[PDB]
Amino acid sequence: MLSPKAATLAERSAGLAFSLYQAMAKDQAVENILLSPVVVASSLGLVSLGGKATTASQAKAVLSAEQLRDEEVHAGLGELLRSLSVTWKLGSRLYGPSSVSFAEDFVRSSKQHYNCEHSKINFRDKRSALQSINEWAAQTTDGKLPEVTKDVERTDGALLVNAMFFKPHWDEKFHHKMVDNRGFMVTRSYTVGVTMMHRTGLYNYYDDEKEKLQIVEMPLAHKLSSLIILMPHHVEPLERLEKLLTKEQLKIWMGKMQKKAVAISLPKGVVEVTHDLQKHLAGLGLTEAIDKNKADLSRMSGKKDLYLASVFHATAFEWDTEGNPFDQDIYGREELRSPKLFYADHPFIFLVRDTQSGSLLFIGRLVRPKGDKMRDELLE
Amino acid sequence: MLSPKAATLAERSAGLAFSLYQAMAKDQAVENILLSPVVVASSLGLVSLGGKATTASQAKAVLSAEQLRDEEVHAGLGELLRSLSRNVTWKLGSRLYGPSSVSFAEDFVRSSKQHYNCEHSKINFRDKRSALQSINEWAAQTTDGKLPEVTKDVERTDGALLVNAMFFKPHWDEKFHHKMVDNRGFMVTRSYTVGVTMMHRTGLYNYYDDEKEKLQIVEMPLAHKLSSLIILMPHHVEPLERLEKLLTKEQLKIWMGKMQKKAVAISLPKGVVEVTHDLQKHLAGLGLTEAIDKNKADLSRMSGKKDLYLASVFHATAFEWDTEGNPFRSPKLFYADHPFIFLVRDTQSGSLLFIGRLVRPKGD
């Protein structure tokens, strides 16, 4: 059960999630998005824990925890991380150059609050360094996330790596055989072959005919959390819908939702996304920590030359049929007669929200699933 | 399995089907087309049987069986008709209607029944309503009411009428689910939509999509894979003219060799299509000019009357599209909501059972 300080930081992490999601969604180089608000917040905590003066205060400001004291930030984020331990695997490792030795007090605190691991790596042996990072991520996620990055640009600073595996476990499972091959429309001119999973059930649903979008709430195991999916009616870039996506608009949409018979079709499989949050966090106010000249990470090691080179947020999010069983007489009940369609064969936004606290576990978007390009025979 | 003589006549009936289909498709008055090549061939065979000199030889020439002997032609088409008589519903009737005054020759009656299962009837065309009632009742009984009417009017009342009444219902090798039926709009033209009932099914079918010629071709096997229904359709709504220019015996062979078994989501109009053609003017255009003209006609073997001529060749068909059949990768769509061409081919011989087109289904 969440303490008042952890409950406060859950608010600040969710606020930062919307902030970070929006910044990344504006970046044209970004396709799929997968963000864990608590994990993103924890990274700033580590900067606030390992940094001094302006480097540390900027991290607190990005988190919007200016009024909060260092103690409640670290203990509160630590409590939040522990609360999430639906199958979920998380690993945090700080990689520094072979020359540097991390401060004993920092090692104690980062392991205590953030379960942060510490590793000295020789970036000069590029292949070996990448192999070490990728093997660590692979073991953390039991092979679900076998690779973080194919290249490390900044080789003179600290790398923070977060390796994650998340698999939503439905409150009402999909039938294991209700799986087939469909075409996913990345654009109206680009189709990718995907595996789709299907289910007709009673779900909280809303169709905005004015804003031309659909919103469905999929409860997770034991109704402790829910997966919310936002999708336009037509195949279009998510930009328009992302302009509408605010904490207040989400509250409006959710109050308009009603339990209806919905026929859901979702892509099935693992979505692997690696983000380097470095430039994005800098854009949000973490400028000093990422610049070699201005960085003050003296609490982390004892050397001013040490800076934050990267913040890797690597996630393997699995869409599968597995969930809790349900009574089969549900279908004999005409409640499920003429369902609404939630046919996710084009880009959508999704959120994983704790039903009780309202805390955001995940925020993301599926723009381009893994699969081969098809030819829409009927396309003109 | 077909004898070498029936096999040769099967080639010529199918060749004639393409020739006749093309002639009728050029006629702007013609909407839907429904032709049974063997039945059309048999009609010419009857003209050769009941006719002498140029009347008979023209019939043989239209059939392209000039090289063959009269007997070989009659026996081979007769074998063909019989061979196409398994788990698919098919009803066929052939009746020769002559004026009340005329009496058919006993030997002709024997031979036309033997080879062509042709019935003979004397009718008084002066009592128009009674004459039409007799023809329509005969066609209805033949098709068990599926084809209740042949024609609303008989123009030429002084000659012989050949009436072919048919009912054909393809029985699928893999049935459609009885509940997978709904109402859709059929695009007759880009500006004209008619409300139809559609039946749907996703399955493994021989399919080919010509990206260049902007058309799709699907093969739907019939009960026990003894025959197949082939559907040819442009990607979008357009007049069939462009596609009909491509439709040759050789091009169909090319397309069929290019087909591959793929997952296909089929949507077809469901119901009975009733088509009555008077092949008289079309067979005349193909070379049967003498049998069709009262002055030149020689049907002396048929009765003993020179005045006797071929007034009409009614090819009346009721073709039913239904869900019924035998129990059973990202699919391609074969969404038949616009005009298409279809063929029914015996998988073994290659012989064409049917050639047609659905341009305007019944509906509002």
């Binding site: 039938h175 209700m178 087939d180 469909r182 075409g183 789709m196 299907h198 289910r199 007709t200 026929a263 079709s265 089969q328 007489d329 279908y331 004999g332 499920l336 369609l341 046919y343 064969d345 829409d376 009927l378 396309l379 003109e380 | 880009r190 749907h200 996703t202 979008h236 709504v237 989501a265 699919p331 769509l333 969404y335 909501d337």
Partner: peptide, 17 residues
């Protein structure tokens, strides 16, 4: 009890140009 309703049908063909 009977099995669940099957998967949603495939998306329709595109409209005219």
């Amino acid at each position: 009890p009977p099995g669940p309703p099957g998967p949603t049908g495939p998306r329709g063909p595109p409209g005219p140009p």
